[PDB]
Amino acid sequence: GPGKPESILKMTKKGKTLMMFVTVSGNPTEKETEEITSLWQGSLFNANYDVQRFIVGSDRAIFMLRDGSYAWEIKDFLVSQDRCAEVTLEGQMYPGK
Numbered sequence: 372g373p374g375k376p377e378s379i380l381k382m383t384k385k386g387k388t389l390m391m392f393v394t395v396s397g398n399p400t401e402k403e404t405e406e407i408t409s410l411w412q413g414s415l416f417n418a419n420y421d422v423q424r425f426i427v428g429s430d431r432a433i434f435m436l437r438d439g440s441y442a443w444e445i446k447d448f449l450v451s452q453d454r455c456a457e458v459t460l461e462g463q464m465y466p467g468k
Contacts, residue, residue, distance in 0.1 A: 375443030376467030379460070383439060390435040390461045391442060392427065397454030401429040407453055408432055415445075430456075443467070 380389075397403040404426060412424035415434060423435040432453075436442040446458050 372447055374467060375446060376460075376465055377443075378466050379462065380439045380442070383462075385439065386437055387439045388435065388437045389439070389442060391433055392459045392461075393432045393434065393449060393453070394430060394457030394459070395432050395449070395453035396430045396456040399430060403453055404429055404432060407449075411448075 380387075383389075395403045395407050398406070408424070408426040411432070412434070415422055415424045420441055421437045423433075423437075425433045425435070427433050434442065434445055436445075442460075449455070449458060
């Protein structure tokens, strides 16, 4: 919600491609993976954002964000929906962990 790191996206700006690796563990298998990957990255493209989102493993998902203006709202959805496990942003020292 309000604790989304606005600092990094507005300070970097110019549409910096930030890849985000998400660990997801409501299901300690690929079930949360599948749930999240298909529903989210399906809607991640359905809401026409310019991103690449991947099935990267059992209890591992990604949303590779590009426009520099939408990732941490998505982060809020994650931990409201994947049960709530782990978000890892790309870059050095994220002030919103």
